[PDB]
């Protein structure tokens, strides 16, 4: 059973810690936590190609893709907390999609997937817990 | 799988940029980068098993040992700042001593106690 964990930091208030587990490698990963210092509504959700913060996010490179980075979006709430409670099967914490060592990432504004009719706030390195 | 790179810091001045190198899988990792904030001295330098800093240097568990995490010291000059530049044989970017995703931290003390400032290593590429 392995484990991740990440500390979310910015300039701003934006903070929080992501937790990462899972049970059975190529099973999914089950990823839980909260954030603060968001704005209340749906703010995008991603894991980047490098666990490089020396300029913060900004260093983080592109959304991972071996997006397999893409991990949706978290909502606020109007203390601006949001809840983080996401089981995603594509990413991974070994093999191939591994994402330890990456960034994590949550974003101003919301992912639409995509499927709209058509600044990076806090981040940090994926850790081993 | 071949670079890491790592930005420690603390509560305190500490702050560093760590560098990891390995272009031949299970071959040499080189590590280089400066650290400043520190007193005049010998600092220990070590690979802490987790990637936790949910408390600071404090969620960042024991010396990594699966000790292997051990990189020797850094020693600050006279403006408390460490160039390193090191290489060790028994880290990797890869295998059982993968090193990505563990916790860099510099002792206060010397290694022949608190922890100045720590760090995520993460893929540089």
């Keep these: 059973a392995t484990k991740a964990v990440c500390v979310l930091k910015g300039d ?9 587990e899972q049970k059975e490698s190529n099973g999914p990963v089950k990823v839980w936590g909260s954030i603060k210092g968001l704005t209340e509504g749906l703010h995008g ?32 709430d109007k203390d601006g907390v949001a809840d983080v409670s996401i089981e995603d ?21 919301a992912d639409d997937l995509g499927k709209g009719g058509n600044s990076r706030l806090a981040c940090g390195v994926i850790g081993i817990a």
Aim: glycine share 14%; proline share 5%.
């Design 89 to 109: 099967s594509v990413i991974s914490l070994s093999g191939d999609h591994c994402i330890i060592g990456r960034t994590l990432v949550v974003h101003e504004k």
């Design 45 to 76: 959700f991603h894991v980047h190609e490098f666990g490089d913060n020396t300029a913060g996010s900004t260093s983080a490179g592109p959304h991972f893709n071996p997006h397999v980075g893409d991990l949706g979006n978290v909502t606020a």
């Design 12 to 20: 701003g208030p934006v903070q929080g810690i992501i937790n990462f």
